[PDB]
Structure formats: structure tokens, C-alpha cells
Amino acid sequence: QIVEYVLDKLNSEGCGLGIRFYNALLDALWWLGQKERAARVLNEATKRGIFPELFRKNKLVWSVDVHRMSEGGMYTALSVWLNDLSDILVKGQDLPQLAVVVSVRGQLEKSSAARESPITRAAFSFLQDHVSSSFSFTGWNGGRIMCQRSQLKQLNIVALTNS
């Protein structure tokens, strides 16, 4: 509760400062072995108001947006996004037509330059070494990682532990 109160006090200088502060703390927590702490801090940050574009849930697409995040924050968001995807397929509540990762958003999408972007390669390698060769790239967009519903049907995925 002391941590939540200090977070509430800090959430008064602006979302511009808040996003950078959360990026810094998430990178630190991820690269210091505190994956569970990073996940819980991201969870308490989401309901605060920071990273409003992080998650989208609907019959069409389940998306995770990381273009504004750091490498550490992207890994933490991907870790909890993959876990939530595994929560479905345990119930008969249908499945979205598509699951995407917004690695790069902007003009770079319609170009091959975004293919070599650090965010894109980092997200692709994380997905490849966690859920095998299931999340492939998009043949129309140069900054998205996609996975069709058929490949979702065949799909706790990431182990979150404190060092």
C-alpha cells in the first residue's frame, strides 16, 4: 500500500512523465530477474491509465502494442499477453480471427526498413523462442507479427518468477 500510494502521488506530473517512469521501472524489473514483479507493476499501471493502447480484446483481433515501450517493457507485456491467450482454449467462448503484435506503428509499416527495427526483431525472437514457429510476420505490413485463428487453435506459457 505504501508503493501504491507513492505511485498515486507520482501520477500527478503527467502521463508524459508516467510512461517514461513505467518504461524505466519495467526495464529494470525485467532485467533484474523480477519478472513477476514486472508483471504486477504493469498490471497496476494498466488500470491507472498509462499505456492505454496496450491491449485490445474483441471478436476480430487480440492485439498488444509495444511501439512506445522499451525492450524490457515489451518483454513483460508479451509475457502477460501470451499467458492470457492461453487462458482461452480452456473454455468454449470462441476465438478471435487474429492475434497481432504492433511492433512498429507509423510510416515505417509500408517499408522494409521496419523489418530490421530493434522492436520488431526483439518481439519476433521472443515469440519464436517462446511459442515456437507459430507467430509469423504479415505479408502486407512490415511492422506486425500475426497469427491466424487456425494456428491459435493448435497453440501459462511464460514462466514468471522472482530471482
Binding site: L60, Q97, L98, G139, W140, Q148
Partner: peptide, 14 residues
């Protein structure tokens, strides 16, 4: 324009 992109556009447009 693959069949995958066409099907996705069909669903989203519908």
C-alpha cells in the same frame, strides 16, 4: 493480396 488478407478484410468490412 493473399487469400488470408482478403478473408481478414472481408470479416472486418462485414
Amino acid at each position: 493480396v493473399s487469400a488470408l488478407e482478403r478473408s481478414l478484410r472481408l470479416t472486418f468490412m462485414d
